[PDB]
Amino acid sequence: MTMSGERECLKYRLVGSQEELASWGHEYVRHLAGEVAKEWQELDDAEKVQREPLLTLVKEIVPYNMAHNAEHEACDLLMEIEQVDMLEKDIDENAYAKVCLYLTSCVNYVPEPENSALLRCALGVFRKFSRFPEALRLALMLNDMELVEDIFTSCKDVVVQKQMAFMLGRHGVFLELSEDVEEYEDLTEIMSNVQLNSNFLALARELDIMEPKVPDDIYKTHLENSARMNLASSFVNGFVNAAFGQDKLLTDDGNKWLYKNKDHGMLSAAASLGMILLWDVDGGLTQIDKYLYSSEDYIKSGALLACGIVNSGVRNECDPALALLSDYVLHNSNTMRLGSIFGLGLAYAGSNREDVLTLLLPVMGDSKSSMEVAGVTALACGMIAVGSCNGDVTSTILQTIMEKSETELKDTYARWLPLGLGLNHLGKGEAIEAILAALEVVSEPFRSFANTLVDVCAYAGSGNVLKVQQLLHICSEHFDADMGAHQGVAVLGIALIAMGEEIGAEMALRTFGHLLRYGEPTLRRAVPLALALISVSNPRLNILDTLSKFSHDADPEVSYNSIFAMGMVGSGTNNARLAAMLRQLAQYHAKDPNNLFMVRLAQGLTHLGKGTLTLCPYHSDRQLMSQVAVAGLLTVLVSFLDVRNIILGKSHYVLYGLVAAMQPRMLVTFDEELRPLPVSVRVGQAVDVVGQAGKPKTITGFQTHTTPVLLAHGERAELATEEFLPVTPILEGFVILRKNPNYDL
Amino acid sequence: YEPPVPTRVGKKKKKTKGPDAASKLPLVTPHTQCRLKLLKLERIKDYLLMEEEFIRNQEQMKPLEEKQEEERSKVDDLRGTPMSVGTLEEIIDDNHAIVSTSVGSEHYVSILSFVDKDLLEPGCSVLLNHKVHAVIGVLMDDTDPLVTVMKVEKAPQETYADIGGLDNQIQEIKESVELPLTHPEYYEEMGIKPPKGVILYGPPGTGKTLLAKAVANQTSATFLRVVGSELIQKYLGDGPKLVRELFRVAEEHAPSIVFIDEIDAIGTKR
Amino acid sequence: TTGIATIEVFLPPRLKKDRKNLLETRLHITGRELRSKIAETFGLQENYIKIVINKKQLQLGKTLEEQGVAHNVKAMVLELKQSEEDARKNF
Amino acid sequence: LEGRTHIFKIHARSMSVERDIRFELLARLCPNSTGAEIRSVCTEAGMFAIRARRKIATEKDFLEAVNKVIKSYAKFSATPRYMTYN
Amino acid sequence: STYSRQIKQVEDDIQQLLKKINELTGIKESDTGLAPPALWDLAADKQTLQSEQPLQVARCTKIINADSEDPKYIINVKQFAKFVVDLSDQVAPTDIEEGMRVGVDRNKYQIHIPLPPKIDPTVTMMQVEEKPDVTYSDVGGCKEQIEKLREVVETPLLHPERFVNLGIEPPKGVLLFGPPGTGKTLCARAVANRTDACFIRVIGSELVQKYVGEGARMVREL
Numbered sequence A: 001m002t003m004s005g006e007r008e009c010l011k012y013r014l015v016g017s018q019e020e021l022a023s024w025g026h027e028y029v030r031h032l033a034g035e036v037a038k039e040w041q042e043l044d045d046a047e048k049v050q051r052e053p054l055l056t057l058v059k060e061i062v063p064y065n066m067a068h069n070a071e072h073e074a075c076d077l078l079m080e081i082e083q084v085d086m087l088e089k090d091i092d093e094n095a096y097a098k099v100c101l102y103l104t105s106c107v108n109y110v111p112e113p114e115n116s117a118l119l120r121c122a123l124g125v126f127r128k129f130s131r132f133p134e135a136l137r138l139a140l141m142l143n144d145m146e147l148v149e150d151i152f153t154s155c156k157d158v159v160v161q162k163q164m165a166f167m168l169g170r171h172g173v174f175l176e177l178s179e180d181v182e183e184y185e186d187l188t189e190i191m192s193n194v195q196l197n198s199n200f201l202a203l204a205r206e207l208d209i210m211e212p213k214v215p216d217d218i219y220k221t222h223l224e225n226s227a228r229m230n231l232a233s234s235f236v237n238g239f240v241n242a243a244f245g246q247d248k249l250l251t252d253d254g255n256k257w258l259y260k261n262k263d264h265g266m267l268s269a270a271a272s273l274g275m276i277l278l279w280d281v282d283g284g285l286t287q288i289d290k291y292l293y294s295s296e297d298y299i300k301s302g303a304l305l306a307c308g309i310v311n312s313g314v315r316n317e318c319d320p321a322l323a324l325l326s327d328y329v330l331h332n333s334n335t336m337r338l339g340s341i342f343g344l345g346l347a348y349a350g351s352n353r354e355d356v357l358t359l360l361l362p363v364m365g366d367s368k369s370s371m372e373v374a375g376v377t378a379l380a381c382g383m384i385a386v387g388s389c390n391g392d393v394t395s396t397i398l399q400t401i402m403e404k405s406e407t408e409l410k411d412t413y414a415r416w417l418p419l420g421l422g423l424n425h426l427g428k429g430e431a432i433e434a435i436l437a438a439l440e441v442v443s444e445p446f447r448s449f450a451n452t453l454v455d456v457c458a459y460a461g462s463g464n465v466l467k468v469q470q471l472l473h474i475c476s477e478h479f480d481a482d483m484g485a486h487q488g489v490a491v492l493g494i495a496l497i498a499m500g501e502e503i504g505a506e507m508a509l510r511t512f513g514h515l516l517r518y519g520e521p522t523l524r525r526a527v528p529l530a531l532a533l534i535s536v537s538n539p540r541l542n543i544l545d546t547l548s549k550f551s552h553d554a555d556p557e558v559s560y561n562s563i564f565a566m567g568m569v570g571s572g573t574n575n576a577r578l579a580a581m582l583r584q585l586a587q588y589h590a591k592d593p594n595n596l597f598m599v600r601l602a603q604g605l606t607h608l609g610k611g612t613l614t615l616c617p618y619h620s621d622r623q624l625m626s627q628v629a630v631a632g633l634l635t636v637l638v639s640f641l642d643v644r645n646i647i648l649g650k651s652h653y654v655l656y657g658l659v660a661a662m663q664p665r666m667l668v669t670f671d672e673e674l675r676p677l678p679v680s681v682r683v684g685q686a687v688d689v690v691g692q693a694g695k696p697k698t699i700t701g702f703q704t705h706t707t708p709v710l711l712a713h714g715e716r717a718e719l720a721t722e723e724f725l726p727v728t729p730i731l732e733g734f735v736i737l738r739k740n741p742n743y744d745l
Numbered sequence B: 001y002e003p004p005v006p007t008r009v010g011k012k013k014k015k016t017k018g019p020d021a022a023s024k025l026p027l028v029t030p031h032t033q034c035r036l037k038l039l040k041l042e043r044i045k046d047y048l049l050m051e052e053e054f055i056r057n058q059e060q061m062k063p064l065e066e067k068q069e070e071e072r073s074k075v076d077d078l079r080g081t082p083m084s085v086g087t088l089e090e091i092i093d094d095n096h097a098i099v100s101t102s103v104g105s106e107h108y109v110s111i112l113s114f115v116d117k118d119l120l121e122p123g124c125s126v127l128l129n130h131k132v133h134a135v136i137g138v139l140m141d142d143t144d145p146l147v148t149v150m151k152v153e154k155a156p157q158e159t160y161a162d163i164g165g166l167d168n169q170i171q172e173i174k175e176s177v178e179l180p181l182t183h184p185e186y187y188e189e190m191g192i193k194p195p196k197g198v199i200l201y202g203p204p205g206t207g208k209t210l211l212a213k214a215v216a217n218q219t220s221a222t223f224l225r226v227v228g229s230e231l232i233q234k235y236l237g238d239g240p241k242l243v244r245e246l247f248r249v250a251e252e253h254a255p256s257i258v259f260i261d262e263i264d265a266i267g268t269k270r
Numbered sequence C: 001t002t003g004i005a006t007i008e009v010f011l012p013p014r015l016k017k018d019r020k021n022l023l024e025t026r027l028h029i030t031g032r033e034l035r036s037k038i039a040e041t042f043g044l045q046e047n048y049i050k051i052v053i054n055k056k057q058l059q060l061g062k063t064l065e066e067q068g069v070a071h072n073v074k075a076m077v078l079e080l081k082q083s084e085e086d087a088r089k090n091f
Numbered sequence D: 001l002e003g004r005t006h007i008f009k010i011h012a013r014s015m016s017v018e019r020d021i022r023f024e025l026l027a028r029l030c031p032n033s034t035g036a037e038i039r040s041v042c043t044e045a046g047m048f049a050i051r052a053r054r055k056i057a058t059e060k061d062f063l064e065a066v067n068k069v070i071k072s073y074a075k076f077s078a079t080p081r082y083m084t085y086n
Numbered sequence E: 001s002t003y004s005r006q007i008k009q010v011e012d013d014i015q016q017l018l019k020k021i022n023e024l025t026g027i028k029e030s031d032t033g034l035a036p037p038a039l040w041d042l043a044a045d046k047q048t049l050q051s052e053q054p055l056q057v058a059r060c061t062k063i064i065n066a067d068s069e070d071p072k073y074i075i076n077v078k079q080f081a082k083f084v085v086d087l088s089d090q091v092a093p094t095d096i097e098e099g100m101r102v103g104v105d106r107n108k109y110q111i112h113i114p115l116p117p118k119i120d121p122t123v124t125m126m127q128v129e130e131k132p133d134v135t136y137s138d139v140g141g142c143k144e145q146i147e148k149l150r151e152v153v154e155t156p157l158l159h160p161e162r163f164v165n166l167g168i169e170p171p172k173g174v175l176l177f178g179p180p181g182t183g184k185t186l187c188a189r190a191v192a193n194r195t196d197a198c199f200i201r202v203i204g205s206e207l208v209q210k211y212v213g214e215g216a217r218m219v220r221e222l
Ligand SMILES: Nc1ncnc2c1ncn2[C@@H]1O[C@H](COP(=O)(O)OP(=O)(O)OP(=O)(O)O)[C@@H](O)[C@H]1O
Pocket: B162, B163, B164, B165, B166, B203, B204, B205, B206, B207, B208, B209, B210, B211
């Protein structure tokens, strides 16, 4: 134990006395286990007849480590020897939480195949102990649909299944249960989020914020010492009042306001009317119908897209959006088409519905379909089939991409064609090699753009430092624009990959700063988009100050992207400081219509849903990635790579892709009969509880509120009292509480 | 003509002072020497490797004019020598400010890019070019002699063991000035902020200042000692000014303990 | 069975009725008759409702079998503000 | 009385109090007391609970806090002198 | 303990890497108020140093022959001097008024830019830039008092349209009084937290000054 002990300290313990290991000391057995791992790495296949005593040593060391609360040290031993499998055999009821927590905290850094190995091992430990909600969370992290189905139907507790259904509905994952399953109706309704609108409205009534907000109350022009202005104000009205169902400006007679906008503004403004009716399909379509019959070309298609916006995030058994939008995907007018595919994509995002995809796919190949229409179709079909690796969508997107001429690919709408392709394989990983080989035949510089986009989307939210190294190598060689388009995609990809875990994101912030410092305009025109993607709905002061330093940038595109990133970073946070900065920018950019429009967009985002909504793609304590939210954010941010022509041009409706990422920052405690149940809870900044044993506090700087409270980014919530037991450890979204038998004993 | 509009919100400097700056590496948990801490450290290391390679490449193909030492030399040339010390009177714009030199003459000059613009507040000492008076820096103000006067540089040698019979008093003062710093988790878990203020009263010689010395011995916070009679000044408004500056210095060195000894002497003595 | 269709229909939450409710009718009838009997069977005004069958808008003129309706099919009811002819005449 | 009960609820919101704290009784026990005295009562009840190495403050702790703050410290109260000025 | 050696190895590597990065990028000085080199626009700094001339701050005193096409402006350049100058070609004649601060060049002292009035830095710092962490929900037992305060100090600013229509002039002053600890400053902090207009906190003891008439000067500038 004292000197190096290379193949020695193990050897004599192996050949000598084989009595109980702990009889020779905790430090000695720790050294012995370290040596066991070291020599296990050395041993080859032919030395399989050398591990006979080693298995006995590990089978005795693991219970010893768990006996003296050294569970984490035990975990490393089986991790190094790649034999974590037997761990589940020796887990006791006093340590399953700690070992599972440590193994899950480790998974964000170990690469494949140890990623899935650790994930499945912790899943098995949870399943053995009947901890169904966390097992379902863990399987969702594994995107194993068969395992999701098995976990859901294995549990016999109806209430636990209801909570798991709530988690699945929040994640955007849906299951087709059998009618033989008890409580099929309510379980399906929970998983379809049909009650999301009513729950949100009940919260808002409880949180007395039902009053509509005019964009003037956000602008606050009375404290300050056009078609674009009207369009920006309609966007602000849609964002602030999102999913509320009431507005003083469009829910009233909005024809004067709606016609106050001109050209494609009427496209977004009418579509904005669908944002206030988000998740309220039944009531929302009742207001869309009036504008569905408008003679003006823009109004009808704007209402068509508002239909899908209204239906976005909620799965209706009788598909309304498909019915209202099917008859306009091959319309002669490109605007009616444009609205229809985008609405259909928003409505059925993350569904992989073969009927919708078959209805939508020939639109891309239609001769009358313009490049804008083809890009919109690609974005939609990607959003329906996000992370599904759909063969049909991949094949047709490849056909559309290689059918276009080289001069046709110069258009930036073609940039949306790989994105949907990338959306198809979002988070899949190494399933793109065939796709990359297919893309190799595409002409350049569009080939580099497409390859970067699909590769990043494949490695989205993985933290693979190798892919980040490749992206930084792409960003390294700068070109004295046309050839350098994919550099912005690589900059966005650094964020798209590093967003998985906190350490990687904070590390990548410095890299983004260096890219902004040394990079070319096209290189630095995407750093704000990367900052927005990596810190969406998370208004930490470092990113806000970094973006503010470049808000008044010499490059107009950098300024626009920085302002929009400031809006996205504090999106839905209702941050007072960020509101003050945006007001100051509006005063500063008063004479610049583009910068003022971006400032108004940022102001609208900052008060998204009156501060009750978030665009963050990560839920379940920032461990579960929502593929639909990632798809929407990716759509908006990649479209912002050409903010001059797409956002500030005629295609600002793409901002409604953010609708795919809108979720309520929620904590609603339900009874076992799904009625609301106000409970005292403590909300405070989350504290990492890996390592330190015993009971460490998981929240710092907390306050006690009644349960219908909004959780900020990084804010955990723990039940203040012990009267109720939560069905799931994660107190986010809709949580069911059960009366504690121990309480009031 | 229209007045310039600043892009910064407010007119005061950034509240944060003396941070780790660019060395703010993410806090890796757990501190225990486990494989997860090992993996987090490796991840930080890989990000640093990627950053190092990228920066080396960029500086490699950067022009000879644009180099770190070359840009620093150009900054020195732009500042020139000598660098006059003026007073930031007003921030007209992001890159424009009214500054007054030591001779009392004001100038509407331009703030250059390399100036730390978050260090600029009205009344702060700025460094200006000798010829064009353009703001070229912000002078880190030296510690005031009064700052030295309050601050107790060396902890007193009197400890709690040197105090006899004041068990309850020691407990009460520890619950307010020592326990909140050593064990804040008690207060956080109880949901109460610690007792705000403490006054020690009693007949002369009973050990009030001795207990304050014992607190100053075993405190990790900056200790400022002020006698009440020191708050009586010779000029109007100088007393309130001294109190305001004492608590400003207390705020600067947070966490801190302000010991206003013999407070009654402000009123009992004329 | 015997040419009668079990159409499960969805009602708006404003009409606080059983959302899982069933309608029974022929298929030789057309969308007009189906809309009228849907309005009658759950206390609704016929002039302000749109009907959704088979994920398609209910064409009123065409009869059910030629529409594409089948057994155990899902139906959806949309409350309307301003009638179709009145909305069209509005501007 | 209603205002004092409301202040007690405000300052003891994040407290780890017991289940049956009679805040109305505590408000009745300090007839003429400022909100600062009520905040100090809550803080001293928490301090009494902490000193006994308890994670939950009982009603007895609040009663001792009232005795220490409202009664014992009443010599130094600024209230009786200052309501002649107001 | 088995990872301790590798922990220290990678930690020392990280520290050396951080030092190496700081070698190429920057982060140094910080005593002469130098910004990080990522914000150094040196070419623009040189162009500003050449093109943008310094301007001495003076005060206009009298405009002679303002009606005609040759108006002469008497300026008082602080402690420097007094001059009779003319406006530059880039300043409108109506943009300069008697008694206002202007900025002039150092060669012919022609008025180049009208300037904001001089305000004492102590007065400037009195305006609140970080709103307090107290809302109206943290004040109990003051329902009527809070309502009366809000309908004077907050409601007219938030919704002035409700007052102008009825020819109503809202009160422009509120005095909160009561025994110590009753919540006067707490309600003021709540107002400052909820307000959107400029909030200035003045403590009466801050208006006491050493010299005669200085406190009145601070009030006037406030
Ligand atoms: N209870 C005590 N135990 C031990 N030493 C004590 C005690 N009380 C006083 N002393 C000694 O008396 C010395 C002087 O007392 P000290 O200055 O602390 O008293 P004080 O109550 O603060 O008086 P004053 O009102 O005059 O400021 C201390 O330095 C200490 O050595």
